Amino acid sequence: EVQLVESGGGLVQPGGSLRLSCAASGSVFKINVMAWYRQAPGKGRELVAGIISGGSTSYADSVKGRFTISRDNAKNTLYLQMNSLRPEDTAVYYCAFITTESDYDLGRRYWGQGTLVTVSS
């Protein structure tokens, strides 16, 4: 089993910046996916940004050009750099990892607990 610990959330002014981190511990084998999700009232849960093993990244239309996903492969840590934050970015942000021990297994998804980011004055 794998545990994900998130940090870096809180209250920021519109136009502001925040960096989230997501550190993995436990029995980490092959990481297939590292991704950020967010939940807000009336918006369900949305994939914000992801990195697939290979380096191929993806972003929600709403955050393209403002958010950057990165990872420290050596430390199994996932980052989200947020710039030019807008009130509509207010949400609980989650990280998820998919891990596998071989191509013959279906993989397992592990979740961070979530961290609130509030963009208001």
Author numbering: 1 to 121
Quote the authors verbatim.
The camelid single domain antibody, referred to VHH or Nanobody, is considered a versatile tool for various biotechnological and clinical applications because of its favorable biophysical properties.
Vobarilizumab, binding interleukin‐6 receptor (IL‐6R), was developed by Ablynx for the treatment of autoimmune diseases and confirmed its low immunogenicity through clinical trials. On the other hand, only Tyr42 among these three positions (42, 50, and 52) was involved in contacts with the CDR3 in the crystal structures of 7D12‐Vob and Vobarilizumab, and with lower values (BSA values were 22.9 Å2 and 9.6 Å2, respectively). In wild‐type 7D12 the identity of the residue at position 106 is Ala, whereas in Vobarilizumab it is Phe, a residue with a bulky and hydrophobic sidechain. The results showed a dramatic decrease in the melting temperature (T m) of 7D12‐Vob (52.2°C) compared with both, wild‐type 7D12 (63.6°C) and Vobarilizumab (70.9°C).
